[PDB]
Design a protein around this nucleic acid. Structure first.
Ligand SMILES: [Zn+2]
Length: 503
RNA sequence: GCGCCCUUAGCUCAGUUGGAUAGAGCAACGACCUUCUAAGUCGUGGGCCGCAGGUUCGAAUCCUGCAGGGCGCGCCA
């Protein structure tokens, strides 16, 4: 209990584009960003008026997942945001997302923000007192040893729980900068108190917290044992003015949000948490700092570019630094990196390994990459014809209810408003392409997992062994292999999958 | 994220915060001692400068820049 990987069958629940929190479905005269790329933009310009563009969501209702398994998941792209563990395919949807990582050892921050760190260190010091005037090329030295020998601004680590003290600034700040004058209490309990991470992992032992607050003088090499969300309050005198919210994985730290007190924002609390929590890595033995979820379609997130982020890729699990591809990722275009064996007529082969399913790939710094995703799932790419016939063989090979769709049926018609078109699109770079699934059955690798997994329906509550693969209903079998196309091959081996019918 | 502030001894301070780093308390020596030159009072002597350049006989000193020293509060899923 509370230790196995739990993920339900994804169901693309869709809503009108007005409900979108970032894009609203309107981006002026920038219809190229709305669709995949320019190739279909030149052809769907007159067809977009007859086909509605909604806000597609790809995700599932998860219960709990162990920290070790989720580390791949947050590296894959399925970053936690509430209990709806979700992701957005890079092809169709109007608001794409994918995890990013930052490295504090060699971050290439811009010179514009270099003046910001010069401001917070002067005021905090107690005037005459100075820790000697020496060279400070590494900015760690003047912050770690200054927060403890004074009472200017001291912090304290806390778990992710409920605290009444934060409520005062949690409401007024939204009423002040977010214009959210109607804040029910459920907006705090749901967001930062019910996480998919294991409750024992969040609790752990206080010893991990004890050494965590001792990060200032702890010697590197000590074994860390912290895994889960983190809350680092920002005390001042005898109150709080900022609340840090982030999640520390067993391999890195992922940040989400920030909160200020409206009028008590004297000490420029916004940039303090960011600049004094990526320096945790140097003092500890951690390796990664995840900024969270990146959105190119939302211009507001451009400040995260200065954080040294890392635009991810979900089709091939190959990290690539944000700055070298700053222009390439612009305008909301697709981003799938090819290989030396690039082909414009055959689909991509996939790899299912313990370390080769989103557990880091070897990367070279000085490399002039090129974009090949445009020639795969677009007008100029011939891979669509091969994908069109790929679905035909799936139906006549084993008997799984996957039927192809016509040429002008890639997106739901505006006449489909009266009947919700529940289903999983086949042309999705995030989803496993049909090329690899075809080789799975031929190679016999599907057989090993066959006969070991149990059929588990939420509305049935029945346990029965699997002896004949074709005896189970095909519609249920359809949902089983859908997750195999989305959530790592092997993976599902150490996991149990549930299904949703028409939720 | 943008703003105006000051970048001189181990310290506080001068040179309208541009033309020698000087007094004073400290630690040093000493004609200064009833064994108060290791708790009097007087000569004072080592303690000399920050990272780069910038436009001028000139730079502790109009500072664009950087690391470190001052002040409203921000386009912060
Ligand atoms: Zn959207």
């Amino acid at each position: 209990m509370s230790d196995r990987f739990v993920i339900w069958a994804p169901s693309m629940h869709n809503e009108p584009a007005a409900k979108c929190g970032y894009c609203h479905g309107n981006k002026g005269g920038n219809m190229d960003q709305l669709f995949a790329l320019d190739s279909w933009a030149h052809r769907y310009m007159n067809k977009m008026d007859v086909v509605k563009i909604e806000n597609c969501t790809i995700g599932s209702f998860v219960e709990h997942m162990d920290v070790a398994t989720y580390d791949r998941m947050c590296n894959m792209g399925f970053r936690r945001s509430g209990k709806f563990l979700y992701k957005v395919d890079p092809l169709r949807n109007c608001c794409r997302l994918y995890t990013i990582r930052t490295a504090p050892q060699e971050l290439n921050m811009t010179k514009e923000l270099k003046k910001c760190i010069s401001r917070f260190a002067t005021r905090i010091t107690s005037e005459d007192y100075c820790p000697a005037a020496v060279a400070s090329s590494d900015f760690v030295g003047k912050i770690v040893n200054a927060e403890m020998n004074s009472k200017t601004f001291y912090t304290r680590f806390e778990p992710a729980l409920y605290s009444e003290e934060k409520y005062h600034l949690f409401v007024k700040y939204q009423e002040k900068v977010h214009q959210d004058y109607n804040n029910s209490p459920k907006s705090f309990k749901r967001f930062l108190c019910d996480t998919p991470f294991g409750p024992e992992a969040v609790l752990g032992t206080q010893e991990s917290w004890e050494q965590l607050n001792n990060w200032q003088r702890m010697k590197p090499g000590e074994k860390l044992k912290h895994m889960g969300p983190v809350h680092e309050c920002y005390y001042y005198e005898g109150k709080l003015i900022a609340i840090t919210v982030s999640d520390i994985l067993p391999s890195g730290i992922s940040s989400v949000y920030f909160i200020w007190d409206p009028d008590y924002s004297k000490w420029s609390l916004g940039k303090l948490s960011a600049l004094r929590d990526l320096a945790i890595i140097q003092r500890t033995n951690l390796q990664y700092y995840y900024l969270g979820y990146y959105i190119e379609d939302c211009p507001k997130m451009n400040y995260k570019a200065n954080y040294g982020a890392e635009v991810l890729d979900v089709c091939h699990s190959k990290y690539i630094p944000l700055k070298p591809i700053q222009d390439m990722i612009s305008r909301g275009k697709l981003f799938v990196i090819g290989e030396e064996e690039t082909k414009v007529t055959k689909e991509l082969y996939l790899v299912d390994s313990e370390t080769g399913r989103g557990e880091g790939f070897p990367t070279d710094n000085v490399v002039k990459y090129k974009n090949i995703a445009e020639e795969i799932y677009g007008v100029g790419g011939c891979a669509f014809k091969s994908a069109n016939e790929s679905a035909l063989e799936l139906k006549e090979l084993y008997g799984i209810p996957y039927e192809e769709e016509d040429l002008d049926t890639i997106y739901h018609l505006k006449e489909h408003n009266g009947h919700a078109p529940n289903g999983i699109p086949n042309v999705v770079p995030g989803l496993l392409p049909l090329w690899e699934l075809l080789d799975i059955m031929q190679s016999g690798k599907i057989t090993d997992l066959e006969g070991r997994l149990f059929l588990f329906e939420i509305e049935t509550e029945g346990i029965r062994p699997l002896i004949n693969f074709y005896s189970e209903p095909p519609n249920v079998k359809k949902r089983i292999c859908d997750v195999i196309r989305l959530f790592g091959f092997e993976t599902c081996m150490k996991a149990v999958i549930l299904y949703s019918e028409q939720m």
